[PDB]
């Protein structure tokens, strides 16, 4: 239960339960982006 | 270069302690919860769930204490009572 | 309640609900059966 | 532009030229535009002494023609649409050769998986083409936008110009050019601005949310922002069911540039917009006519029995009551709505009240009309939780700090309203209808708003006898249970009876069994051409009839069962005029007045 | 489902019948209630689960809670010459639960 | 890089259109003498302040060139574009050729006209000394005088500009005569890309700000220089040019401070309004959207709310876009800079007589029977009943306002009810009088009418103050308020109305509002009995639901109720079928008067202030006592209604004044009150049919 969450085990895996109130919006994040320098006319790519 | 880039969907959820079992003296507390890719849209508000997650820490642009952080969970998977209501 | 009944009073016989508020002009399918329970109370005849 | 076109672009053009050479339907259509503009240019130029440059492409014509170019528009529009318009912009220069601007594209058809509700429009397949269906929920105040700016160098009488580009003018992320508005010359002189030698374009954004009957109900609405260039700005309004097509760009650089989370700004560049029709919508069905469809109407229009069959074909689901659905058919036709010189407009819409024993079709007949009238809205009366079916609340938080929205009857400005359970609907609406019925104007006088808005629309009322049942041995007024003015405001009051019998009741079983075990789509096309083209003037052969009957009933009926008023004079005109529209008659004839009398004989006695 | 000010946070407040789902809800001046705060207790007694279908959340919450209710006769005096359902304002089916 | 700001050219050539203007301003006599020069003499007389330029003259000036084979080089097709250039250059010519002042400068004149005079004088002395010093420094006009002009620095001619300049377009008549320039466009029809053009738009002026000063130039004072510093203000905002830019401190160590002067700063009178779309021009299903209008100078009070106008003016961008994120770059807001105004229902307060309006009154009179001619000319699209429509003409002319000279006022106005049954049209008469009445207004029983009949209070959008916003009885004043479905109003509405019939004012004492407010409205009301139609078995005090205290504030009520009849309904059915067969009204040996000329006639009659003869004075009294004695002693049974009152005697006087004003007569005859009493009694003789 959330009542027993602690600063102990921060960033361990945790198992907990409740009710979902709300679900917001499907925001958009990258996973590949291709990039050019506006002055060097020079290209790279980044992945996450 | 947006037209040669690939993107993904993520979502913000909030979970609160079930009002059936909380302190008589005050409101329930809750956690900001996030999920990515195919884990999105699997869940409907008001369903009963167990989350397996990384209890993690972020900084909030508050306006809270003299130096502090806010907890959040990155969901790395989810399951439920077989279908709520 | 009077504002409740008039909708079901239609949806029981044409299985749609039509809404006329300025915001949105929906006509949504109810697609429902009803099993109902009621009492004979105030079967006693008077008009008032 | 300045860079040298690579074959990856040069091919795309000439490959698209073999398509248009194959399907001449587009080459002659773009020609048909510059036919139209030059006729108007000649009309302006040569008597005082446009169409907005886009074409719709059937995607069915691409699939069989060029499979990889099919996938190109869908998967990589930013690399396939800019060259296709670059072809058309030189096809247009090839069709014309008179002396002496952009040309643009639009699409139609099926997109497979790419047609999806904004519930499932997601950050997969951003750059791909999309189609979305839903409600247009708000619209932005249509701002003018700069593209070319023009200046004057008074020290020389030269003119200078500057041109602007941004995130919404090219599908590809062109290198940004944050040019600075020129308040000083290169030499250092002053400048002034030649407003109107500069050029402008309309910007608008409209926000679309998922259509509520397909929505998995209970959940929240989800909505996305559509930007419209100069053309389509005029053809959306809030609350209508709208399909859009475009590119779901994901522009800006939030977070990863500047400093900090919320991700990229996602929106659709709208390249096609269509209104569409669904139940209780602010737009008509508007079926197109071929030169064949009109031929069938003209075969019919001179046959001396159409009104009897047309009156019957409405509602095979119901037995009898031809004598009523005659009039409901005439409500679809309506009057002429004459507007007088230097004096107030005069009603054309005919408004009908149905009442009878609760067994009858009152609630069901209206779902023919709502399904088959050109434009209709249905209201329960009680349950119009706003001001009513007409007016609305008025407040804002956005930049302008006020807004207006319209009730059902203001939205149904010409067509039909289905009102049912009519005597449940409270006085607050009834006295508002007394404003409407014969004035067809609405007034409100809130804190800020003190103005008049139109409501030139037609009504069916359906009601129940307050005692639960009626029969003609019980005096026939008190069962109506409404103020006498409403019994005047509505034009035809029909009383439907089912004190039970057997003789007529015998046939009903086999008709219902046959109904569990002429046609609708022609009626819409029959009505709209009749409505659009035909405006019958009166004729002396029928002007006398309406005087004979009206003047008699005021002697008789004021000694019998019903009231007669100067209001019911004009209802004779409208009904005569409606039947002439059924005839498609260029003028009224005596037969139409004899029909007007007959309907009132049944309705009164 | 209703406001909480801090961060404009949204959460459910359950009824007392949810907060006491295992145990007992103690109601004072049982007569002095409106429509909504009467249908709630009646739904709980009737079938021990409370609906929610508001603010976009749809749920049925366990309300398996016992009751002790306190009430007052209409006019204070018991008026022993009349039955309880005539003495109190409440009708028999809420009274029979 | 001259590839930046690239050069382009266009068919215009302003460098010789100025050469056209410098002839037109002096070379026009088609309508003292070259009238613009004499008008500029009245500026040199300092007796007017605003210059109105009409395209009507420019066109016929070019004909006097073109028909003489002389090139036009059209100004008109240019001027309907880009008028912000011309309006700031066309005015430069007038500075360079205008007459010299004649009425010499004097104390009884507006203070701005000496401040400008002093700088204009100081300007010439600076040339007069600098030329002599240059000449005196050890050694031809066009050679020397250009040296003086360049070495000096001077007040600019826009800061010595005595006057505000405006334009008006050319009406369609002048467009079709000699065979565009001003279609009165819909606010929807404007389609954006008209920015820059001179346009005409018409619609309701829903809301206005109050007039306040807005600065165009800031004047700053520097002591250590003595030179003034002038900053042009162009946007909504400015920052104070505190660092002294003076030509004497620039090449100086110390850069001494300066202070603004709040009268040397050239202002202009600034006002703005919304025009909402004119409702009949809205498409099907759409909404009357709004446009923002900005005003400068002498025009400023010509716009008043609740009226319909043509606005002519120049349609322009403003720099606004939303709030940063809700943006797609280089967006603009837009506004219309108003230049000239005309309004389709005119202000009664302007009514002077000139060569075209007197003959429009005189030709109406000479046919005679004017009073019956105008009654039938009111709402001739509905049948007969002249006594009602004949009284509506008196409602307009209204009688006389009386001030006792001793702290008392009594209403010079007519309040009327149109009680009856369905089918004898009411709202059509209400609507007809709303059109024929300037400042006329139309109302309805229910909904907003609490605030809608009252002052709201509003935080004013353009400037940081609260304002009272007037409901119908305040959006109308000195004019008619029309009420319909009357009895379906409520006590909170009536107790606002009941005070307004009795007296010209309203009072409020809730929340931030404590004012006493001027109504000055005529209330014309349509109402229905308890059962829609009358019941003959019910006495009128019971047939009518209204309380007789409020009813006594109606100076006439009409029992305008129908009874079926064999003949009379036949002529009605002719008129309705005739007017439905076509727009035209019956072929009587009559003409129904055009409303605008009747409005001019009424506006003249309103100027009349008639006096009662002693002959009628003693007759009015004796008729009143016989009325009051009969009304009380006999008429309190059966069909009898109400009581005679002092108020009904004053009604007869106000009606008797109204009749005399319609005669245009300075005195009230014995022949008038014998008509006024007839209308009072006849309104109920219907009840005996
Ligand atoms: N004249 C009729 N002919 C055939 N069916 C009818 C008729 N009148 C009513 N019905 C039946 O009534 C049902 C529709 O409900 P309806 O009686 O119209 O409700 P309401 O009384 O509210 O109008 C349909 O199933 C239809 O079969
Ligand atoms: N005597 C008449 N002459 C001409 N038209 C009339 C007459 N009486 C009624 N009408 C018509 O009837 C309508 C009047 O409706 P009305 O009676 O004013 O509604 P209300 O019941 O609210 O008064 C108008 O459209 C008008 O054209
Ligand atoms: Zn200085």
Of D305, D229, D226, D302, the residue nearest D266 (C-alpha): D226
Q: Write the CB contacts of F110 (distance below 8 Å, at least 6 apart in sequence).
A: F46
Neighbours of D517 (CB within 10 A): 6
Query: CA F552, CA D492: separation in Å to the nearest integer?
Result: 39
Which 3 state secondary structure label does DSSP give F77?
A: helix
Query: CA D578, CA D348: separation in Å to the nearest integer?
Result: 10
Q: Write the CB contacts of B78 (distance below 8 Å, at least 6 apart in sequence).
A: B35, B39, B42, B43, B49, B50, B51, B52
Across the interface, which of F14, F289, F448 has its CB nearest the CB of D446? F448
C-beta separation of F394 from F534 below 8 A = no
Backbone angles phi, psi at D484, to 5 degrees: -55, -30
Neighbours of F281 (CB within 10 A): 15
Query: CA D142, CA F323: separation in Å to the nearest integer?
Result: 15
SS (H, E, C) D410-422: HHCCCCEEEECCH
- H/E stretch holding B16 reads strand B6-16
- List the beta bridge partners of residue F612: F668
DSSP-assigned letter for residue F36:
H
Angle, helix F370-377 to helix F646-662, in steps of 10 degrees: 100
What's the token pair of residue A5?
């969450």
- H/E stretch holding D270 reads strand D265-275
Interface test with B, best of A20, A22, A29, A35 (most B CBs within 10 A): A20
Produce one character per residue of F441-458: b if its CB has 16 or more CB atoms within 10 Å, e if not: bbbbbbbbbebbbbbbee
- H/E stretch holding F507 reads strand F505-507
Cα–Cα–Cα angle for F23, F24, F30, rounded to 5 degrees: 125
Query: CA D605, CA F113: separation in Å to the nearest integer?
Result: 85
- List the beta bridge partners of residue F205: F275
* Nearest residue in D to A46, CA atom: D256
Q: How was this structure determined?
A: cryo-EM
| DSSP codes joined into one string, F637-689 | STT--S---HHHHHHHHHHHHHHHHHTT-SEE-HHHHHHHHHHHHHHHHGGG-
Q: Is D366 in the pocket of ligand 1 (CB under 6 A)?
A: no
Q: Write the CB contacts of F472 (distance below 8 Å, at least 6 apart in sequence).
A: D445, D450, F441, F443, F449, F452, F453, F481
| DSSP codes joined into one string, D69-95 | HHHHHHH-HHHHHHHHHHHHHHHHHHH
Query: CA D209, CA D221: separation in Å to the nearest integer?
Result: 6
* Nearest residue in F to D195, CA atom: F196
Nearest-neighbour CA in chain A from D385: distance (Å): 28
DSSP-assigned letter for residue F570:
H
Nearest-neighbour CA in chain F from D215: distance (Å): 26
Structure's resolution in angstroms: 3.8
DSSP-assigned letter for residue F531:
B
Query: CA F270, CA F211: separation in Å to the nearest integer?
Result: 6
Backbone angles phi, psi at F115, to 5 degrees: -60, -45
Contacts of F306 in chain D (CB under 8 A): 450
What's the token pair of residue D600?
């009132």
C-beta separation of B36 from D283 below 8 A = no
By the 10 Å C-beta count (0-12 exposed, 13-18 middle, 19+ buried), D496 is classed as: middle
C-beta separation of D50 from D40 below 8 A = yes
Q: Is the Cβ pair B31, A25 closer than 8 Å?
A: no
- List the beta bridge partners of residue D206: D139, D226
Query: CA D557, CA C15: separation in Å to the nearest integer?
Result: 41
Query: CA F547, CA F560: separation in Å to the nearest integer?
Result: 19
Query: CA F402, CA F420: separation in Å to the nearest integer?
Result: 33
Q: Which chains have 3+ CB pairs within 8 A of E?
A: A, B, D
Ligand 2, residues at Cβ distance < 6 Å: D 346-347, 438, 485, 566-567; F 382-383, 422-428, 572, 576
Query: CA E18, CA A14: separation in Å to the nearest integer?
Result: 27
Interface test with D, best of B3, B12, B13, B45 (most D CBs within 10 A): B3
Nearest CA to ligand 1 atom 4: D318
C-beta separation of E49 from E60 below 8 A = yes
Q: What share of chain D is helix, strand, coil (3-state, %, to 5)?
A: 35, 20, 45
Query: CA D150, CA E2: separation in Å to the nearest integer?
Result: 56
Query: CA F325, CA F333: separation in Å to the nearest integer?
Result: 16
Q: Which chains have 3+ CB pairs within 8 A of A?
A: B, D, E
For chain B, the straight-line distance linking the first and the last C-alpha, in angstroms and rounded, comes to: 46
What's the token pair of residue F623?
């008729």
Q: Write the CB contacts of D380 (distance below 8 Å, at least 6 apart in sequence).
A: C6, C7, C10, C18, C19, C20, D420, D421, D424, D425
Of F495, F517, F494, the residue nearest F506 (C-alpha): F517
- N residues, chain A: 48
C-beta separation of D92 from D28 below 8 A = no
Query: CA F148, CA D487: separation in Å to the nearest integer?
Result: 91
In this structure, is the dihedral angle defined by the CA atoms of residues D513, D516, D517 and D518, taken in order, positive or negative? positive
Query: CA F483, CA F501: separation in Å to the nearest integer?
Result: 13
* Nearest residue in A to E60, CA atom: A19
Query: CA F556, CA F534: separation in Å to the nearest integer?
Result: 18
Query: Which residue blocks in F427-567 are alpha helix, DSSP H?
Result: 427-436, 449-452, 472-475, 491-502, 540-543, 548-551
**How many angstroms separate the alpha carbon of residue D214 from the centre of ligand 1?**
28
Alpha carbon D588 to chain centroid distance?
30
Of D14, D13, D18, D15, the residue nearest D85 (C-alpha): D13
Query: CA F663, CA F656: separation in Å to the nearest integer?
Result: 11
| DSSP codes joined into one string, F148-183 | HHHHS----TTTS--SEEEEE---HHHHHTT-----
- H/E stretch holding F200 reads strand F198-208
C-beta separation of D459 from D351 below 8 A = yes
Interface test with D, best of C22, C26, C28 (most D CBs within 10 A): C22
Contacts of A22 in chain E (CB under 8 A): 10, 56-57
Residue whose CB lies within 8 A of the most ligand 2 atoms, among F380, F381, F384, F423, for a mutation test: F423
Q: Is D38 in the pocket of ligand 1 (CB under 6 A)?
A: no
Q: Write the CB contacts of D18 (distance below 8 Å, at least 6 apart in sequence).
A: none
Q: Is the Cβ pair E19, B85 closer than 8 Å?
A: no
Q: Is D281 in the pocket of ligand 1 (CB under 6 A)?
A: no
Query: CA F651, CA F61: separation in Å to the nearest integer?
Result: 58
**How many angstroms separate the alpha carbon of residue F424 from the centre of ligand 2?**
5
- Alpha-carbon distance values, A4 to A7, A9, A17, A18, B75 (Å): 10, 11, 12, 13, 19
**Cβ of D455 under 8 Å from any chain F Cβ?**
no
> Long-range contacts for E44-53 (Cβ within 8 Å, ≥24 apart)?
E44/E15, E44/E17, E45/E94, E45/E97, E46/E97, E50/E14, E50/E15, E50/E17, E50/E18, E52/B46, E52/E1, E52/E12, E53/D218
Which single residue is written with the structure tokens 């009165």? F184
Which 3 state secondary structure label does DSSP give D250?
A: strand
Q: Is the Cβ pair D220, E53 closer than 8 Å?
A: no
Q: What share of chain C is helix, strand, coil (3-state, %, to 5)?
A: 25, 10, 60
Of D211, D238, D231, the residue nearest D106 (C-alpha): D231
Kind of pairing between the strands at F164-168 and F50-54 = parallel
DSSP-assigned letter for residue D478:
G
- Tally of CA atoms within 13 A in the half-sphere of D161 that contains its CB: 13
For chain D, the straight-line distance linking the first and the last C-alpha, in angstroms and rounded, comes to: 81
Find out whether D86 is annotated in a ligand binding site.
Answer: no
In this structure, is the dihedral angle defined by the CA atoms of residues F196, F200, F203 and F204, taken in order, positive or negative? positive
Cα–Cα–Cα angle for D54, D144, D257, rounded to 5 degrees: 95
Q: Write the CB contacts of F368 (distance below 8 Å, at least 6 apart in sequence).
A: none
Query: CA E12, CA D328: separation in Å to the nearest integer?
Result: 51
What's the token pair of residue E38?
């009467």
Neighbours of D117 (CB within 10 A): 17
What's the token pair of residue D291?
């030169």
Which 3 state secondary structure label does DSSP give D46?
A: coil
Of F47, F301, F21, the residue nearest F162 (C-alpha): F47
Q: What is the CATH number of domain F356-688?
A: 3.40.50.300
Query: CA D411, CA C19: separation in Å to the nearest integer?
Result: 13
SS (H, E, C) D430-451: HHHHHHHCCCCEEECCCCCCCC
By the 10 Å C-beta count (0-12 exposed, 13-18 middle, 19+ buried), F373 is classed as: middle
Q: Is the Cβ pair D123, B3 closer than 8 Å?
A: no
Which single residue is written with the structure tokens 């119901």? D318
In this structure, is the dihedral angle defined by the CA atoms of residues D251, D257, D259 and D261, taken in order, positive or negative? positive
Does residue D42 come out as left (phi exceeding 0), alpha (psi in the -120 to 50 range) or beta?
Answer: alpha
**Cβ of E37 under 8 Å from any chain B Cβ?**
no
Query: CA F144, CA F167: separation in Å to the nearest integer?
Result: 39
DSSP-assigned letter for residue F380:
T
**Cβ of D450 under 8 Å from any chain F Cβ?**
yes
Q: Write the CB contacts of D396 (distance below 8 Å, at least 6 apart in sequence).
A: D402, D403
C-beta separation of D81 from D105 below 8 A = yes
**Cβ of D192 under 8 Å from any chain F Cβ?**
yes
List, in sequence order, every beta strand (DSSP E) within D347-435.
352-356, 376-379, 416-419
Does residue D326 come out as left (phi exceeding 0), alpha (psi in the -120 to 50 range) or beta?
Answer: alpha
Q: Write the CB contacts of D537 (distance below 8 Å, at least 6 apart in sequence).
A: D586, D587, D588, F581
Of F415, F400, F392, F441, the residue nearest F502 (C-alpha): F415
Q: Does domain D5-114 have CATH number 3.40.50.300?
A: no
Query: CA B74, CA D604: separation in Å to the nearest integer?
Result: 75
Q: Is the Cβ pair D407, C22 closer than 8 Å?
A: yes
Contacts of D218 in chain E (CB under 8 A): 53, 56, 58
Of D218, D162, D212, the residue nearest D185 (C-alpha): D162
Considering only CA atoms, give the Rg of chain D.
30
For chain B, give the residues followed by a break (C–N over 2.5 Å): 63
- N residues, chain F: 689
DSSP-assigned letter for residue D266:
E
Find out whether D356 is annotated in a ligand binding site.
Answer: yes
C-beta separation of D270 from D244 below 8 A = yes
Contacts of D488 in chain F (CB under 8 A): 422-423, 532
| Cβ-based contacts under 8 A for chains D and E | 5
Neighbours of A2 (CB within 10 A): 18
Contacts of E60 in chain D (CB under 8 A): none
Query: CA F262, CA F283: separation in Å to the nearest integer?
Result: 49
| DSSP codes joined into one string, F388-447 | HHHHHHHHHH----EE-SSS-EE-----EE----TTS--HHHHHHHHHHSTT-EE--SSS
Find out whether D360 is annotated in a ligand binding site.
Answer: yes
| DSSP codes joined into one string, chain A | -GGG--STTTTSEEEEEEEEEE----EEEEEEEEEE-TTT--EEEEE-
**How many angstroms separate the alpha carbon of residue D523 from the centre of ligand 1?**
23
Query: CA D246, CA E89: separation in Å to the nearest integer?
Result: 64
Query: CA F245, CA F258: separation in Å to the nearest integer?
Result: 10
Interface test with D, best of F330, F379, F513 (most D CBs within 10 A): F330
- H/E stretch holding F341 reads strand F333-343
Query: CA F484, CA D442: separation in Å to the nearest integer?
Result: 12
Nearest CA to ligand 1 atom 6: D361
């Amino acid at each position: 239960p959330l009542r027993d969450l602690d600063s102990e085990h921060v960033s361990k895996i945790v198992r907990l339960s409740g009710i979902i109130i709300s679900t917001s919006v499907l925001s958009s994040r990258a996973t590949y982006l291709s990039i050019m320098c506006r002055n060097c006319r020079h290209t790279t790519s980044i992945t996450i | 270069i947006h037209e040669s880039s690939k993107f993904i969907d993520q979502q913000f959820l909030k979970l609160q302690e079930i009002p059936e079992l909380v302190p008589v003296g005050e409101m329930p507390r809750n956690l900001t919860m996030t999920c990515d890719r195919y884990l999105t849209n699997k869940v409907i508000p008001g369903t009963r769930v167990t989350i397996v997650g990384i209890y993690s820490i972020y900084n909030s642009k508050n306006g809270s204490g003299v130096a502090i952080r806010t907890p959040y969970i990155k969901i790395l998977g989810i399951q439920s009572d077989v279908e709520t209501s | 309640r009077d504002e409740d009944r008039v909708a079901i009073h239609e949806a029981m016989e044409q299985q749609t609900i039509s809404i006329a508020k300025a915001g949105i002009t929906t006509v949504l399918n109810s697609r429902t059966s009803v099993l109902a329970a009621a009492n004979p109370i105030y079967g006693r005849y008077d008009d008032l | 532009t300045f860079f040298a076109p690579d074959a990856v672009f040069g091919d795309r053009v000439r490959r698209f030229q073999e398509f248009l050479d194959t399907f001449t339907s587009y080459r002659d259509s773009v020609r048909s535009i510059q036919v139209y503009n030059s006729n108007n240019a000649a009309n302006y130029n040569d008597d005082q002494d446009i169409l907005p440059h886009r074409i719709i492409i059937s995607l069915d014509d691409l699939r069989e023609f060029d499979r990889s170019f099919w996938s190109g528009i869908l998967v990589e529009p930013a690399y396939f649409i800019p060259p296709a318009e670059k072809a058309l912009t030189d096809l247009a220069d090839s069709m014309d050769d008179v002396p002496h601007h952009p040309w643009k594209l639009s699409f139609k058809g099926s997109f497979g998986a790419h047609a999806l509700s904004p519930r499932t429009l997601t950050a997969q397949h951003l750059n791909k083409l999309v189609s979305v269906e839903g409600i247009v929920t708000k619209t932005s105040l249509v701002r003018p936008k700069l593209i070319r700016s023009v200046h004057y160098a008074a020290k020389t009488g030269r003119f200078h110009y500057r041109d602007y580009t941004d995130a919404t003018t090219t599908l590809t992320t062109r290198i940004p050019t944050p040019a600075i508005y020129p308040t000083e010359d290169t030499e250092g002189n002053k400048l002034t601005t030649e407003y109107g030698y500069s050029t402008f374009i309309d910007h608008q954004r409209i926000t679309v949310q998922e259509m509520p009957e397909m929505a998995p109900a209970g959940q929240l609405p989800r909505s996305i922002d559509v930007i419209l260039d100069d053309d389509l700005v005029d053809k959306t309004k809030p609350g209508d069911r709208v399909n859009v097509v475009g590119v779901f760009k994901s522009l800006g650089a939030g977070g990863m540039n500047q400093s900090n989370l919320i991700g990229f700004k996602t929106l659709i560049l709208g390249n096609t917009v269509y209104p569409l029709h669904a139940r209780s919508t602010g737009v008509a069905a508007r079926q197109m006519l071929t030169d064949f469809d009109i031929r069938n109407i003209n075969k019919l229009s001179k046959k001396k029995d159409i009104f009897d069959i047309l009156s019957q074909s409405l509602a095979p689901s119901i037995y009898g009551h031809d004598h009523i659905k005659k009039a409901i058919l005439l409500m679809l036709m309506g009057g002429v709505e004459k507007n007088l010189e230097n004096g107030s407009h005069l009603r054309g819409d005919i408004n009908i009240l149905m009442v009878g024993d609760p067994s009858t079709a009152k609630s069901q007949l209206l779902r023919f009309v709502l399904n088959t009238a050109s434009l209709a809205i249905a209201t329960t009366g009680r349950g119009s939780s706003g001001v009513g079916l007409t007016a609305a609340v008025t407040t804002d938080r956005e930049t302008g700090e006020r807004r207006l929205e319209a009730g059902a009857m203001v939205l149904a400005d010409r067509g039909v309203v289905c009102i049912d359970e009519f005597d449940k609907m409270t006085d607050v609406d009834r006295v508002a209808i007394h404003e409407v019925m014969e004035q067809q104007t609405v007034t409100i006088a809130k804190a800020g708003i003190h103005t008049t808005l139109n409501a030139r629309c037609s009504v069916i009322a359906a009601a129940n006898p307050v005692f639960g049942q009626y029969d003609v041995n019980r005096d026939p007024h008190q069962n109506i249970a409404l103020p006498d003015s409403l019994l005047s405001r509505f034009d035809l009051l029909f009383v439907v009876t089912d004190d039970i019998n057997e003789i007529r009741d015998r046939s009903i079983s086999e008709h219902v069994l046959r109904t569990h075990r002429v046609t609708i789509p022609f009626l819409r096309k029959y009505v709209q051409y009749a409505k659009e083209r035909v405006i019958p003037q009166l004729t002396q052969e029928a002007i006398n009839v309406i005087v004979k009957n009206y003047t008699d009933l005021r002697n008789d009926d004021n000694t019998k069962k019903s009231p007669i008023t100067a209001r019911t004079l004009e209802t004779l005109i409208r009904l005569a005029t409606a039947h002439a529209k059924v005839r498609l008659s260029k003028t009224v004839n005596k037969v139409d007045a004899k029909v007007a009398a007959n309907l009132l004989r049944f309705a009164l006695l | 489902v209703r406001k909480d000010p801090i961060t404009k946070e949204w959460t459910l407040e359950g009824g007392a019948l949810v907060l006491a789902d295992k145990g007992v809800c103690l109601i004072d001046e049982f007569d002095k209630m409106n429509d909504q705060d009467r249908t709630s207790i009646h739904e709980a007694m009737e079938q021990q689960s409370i609906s929610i279908s508001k603010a976009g959340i749809v749920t049925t919450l366990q309300a398996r809670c016992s009751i002790i209710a306190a009430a007052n006769p209409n006019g204070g005096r018991y008026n022993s010459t009349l039955p309880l359902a005539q003495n109190v304002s409440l009708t028999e089916p809420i009274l029979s639960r | 890089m001259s590839a930046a700001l690239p050069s382009i050219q266009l068919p215009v050539d302003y460098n010789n259109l100025f050469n056209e203007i410098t002839d037109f301003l002096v070379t026009f006599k088609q309508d003292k003498g070259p009238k613009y020069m004499a008008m500029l003499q009245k500026v040199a007389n300092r007796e007017l302040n605003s210059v109105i330029i009409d395209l009507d003259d420019i066109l016929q000036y070019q004909n006097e060139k073109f028909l003489q084979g002389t090139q036009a080089d059209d100004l008109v097709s240019a001027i309907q574009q880009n008028a912000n250039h011309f309006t700031e250059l066309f005015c430069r010519a007038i500075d360079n050729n205008m007459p010299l002042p004649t009425k010499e400068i004097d104390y009884k004149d507006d203070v701005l006209d000496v401040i400008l005079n002093q700088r204009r004088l100081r300007n010439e002395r600076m040339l007069s000394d600098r030329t002599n010093e240059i000449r005196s420094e050890n050694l031809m006009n066009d050679a020397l005088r250009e040296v003086v002009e360049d070495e000096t620095e001077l007040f600019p001619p826009n800061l010595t500009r005595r006057y505000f300049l405006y334009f008006k377009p050319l009406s369609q008549n002048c467009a079709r005569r000699y065979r565009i320039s001003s279609k009165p466009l819909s606010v929807r029809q404007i389609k954006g890309d008209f920015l820059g053009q001179l346009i005409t738009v018409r619609g309701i002026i829903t809301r206005v700000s109050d007039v306040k000063p807005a600065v165009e130039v800031i004047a700053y004072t520097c002591d250590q220089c003595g030179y003034e510093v002038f900053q042009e203000v162009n946007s909504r905002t400015f920052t104070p040019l505190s660092e002294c830019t003076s030509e004497e401190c620039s090449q100086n160590q110390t850069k001494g401070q300066l202070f603004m002067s709040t009268r040397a700063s050239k202002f202009s009178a600034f006002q703005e309004c919304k025009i909402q779309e004119l409702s009949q021009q809205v498409p099907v299903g759409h909404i009357p959207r709004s446009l923002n209008i900005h005003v400068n100078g002498t025009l400023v009070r010509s716009l008043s709310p609740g009226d319909i106008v043509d606005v002519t003016g120049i349609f322009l961008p403003a720099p606004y876009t939303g709030f940063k994120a809700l943006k797609a770059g280089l967006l603009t807001e837009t506004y219309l800079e108003a230049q000239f105004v005309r309004q389709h229902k005119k202000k009664f307060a302007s009514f002077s007589l000139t060569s075209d309006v007197e003959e429009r009154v005189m030709e109406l009179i000479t046919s005679g029977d004017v009073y019956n001619r105008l009654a039938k000319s009111i709402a001739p699209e509905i049948y007969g009943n002249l006594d009602v429509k004949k009284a509506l003409l008196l409602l307009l002319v209204g009688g006389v306002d009386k001030r006792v000279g001793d702290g008392m006022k009594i209403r010079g106005d007519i309040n009327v009810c149109l009680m009856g049954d369905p089918g004898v049209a009411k709202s059509q008469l209400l609507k007809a009088i709303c059109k024929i009445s300037p400042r006329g207004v139309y109302t309805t029983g229910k909904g907003s009418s609490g605030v809608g009949l009252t002052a709201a209070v509003m935080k004013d959008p353009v400037t940081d103050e609260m304002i009272l916003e007037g409901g119908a009885l305040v959006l109308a004043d000195n004019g008619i308020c029309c009420i319909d479905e009357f009895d379906k109003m409520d006590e909170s509405d009536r107790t606002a109305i009941h005070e307004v019939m009795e007296q010209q004012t309203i009072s409020i004492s809730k929340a931030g509002i404590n004012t006493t407010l001027n109504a000055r409205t005529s209330i014309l009301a349509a109402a229905n009995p308890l059962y829609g139609r009358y019941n003959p078995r019910l006495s009128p005090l019971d047939n009518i639901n209204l309380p007789a205290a409020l009813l006594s504030r109606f100076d006439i009520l009409f029992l305008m109720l129908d009874i079926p009849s064999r003949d009379d309904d036949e002529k009605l059915a002719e008129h309705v079928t005739y007017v439905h067969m076509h727009n035209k009204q019956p072929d009587l040996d009559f003409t129904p008067v055009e409303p605008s000329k009747m409005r001019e006639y009424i506006a003249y009659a309103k100027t009349k202030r008639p006096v009662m003869s002693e002959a009628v004075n003693d007759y009015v009294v004796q008729a009143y006592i016989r009325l009051r004695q009969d009304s009380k002693r006999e008429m309190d049974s059966k069909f009898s209604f109400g009581q005679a009152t002092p108020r009904t005697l004053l009604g007869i006087i106000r009606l008797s004044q109204a009749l005399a004003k319609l005669r245009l007569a300075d005195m009230v005859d014995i022949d008038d009150v014998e008509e006024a009493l007839r209308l009072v009694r006849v309104s109920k003789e219907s009840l005996y049919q």
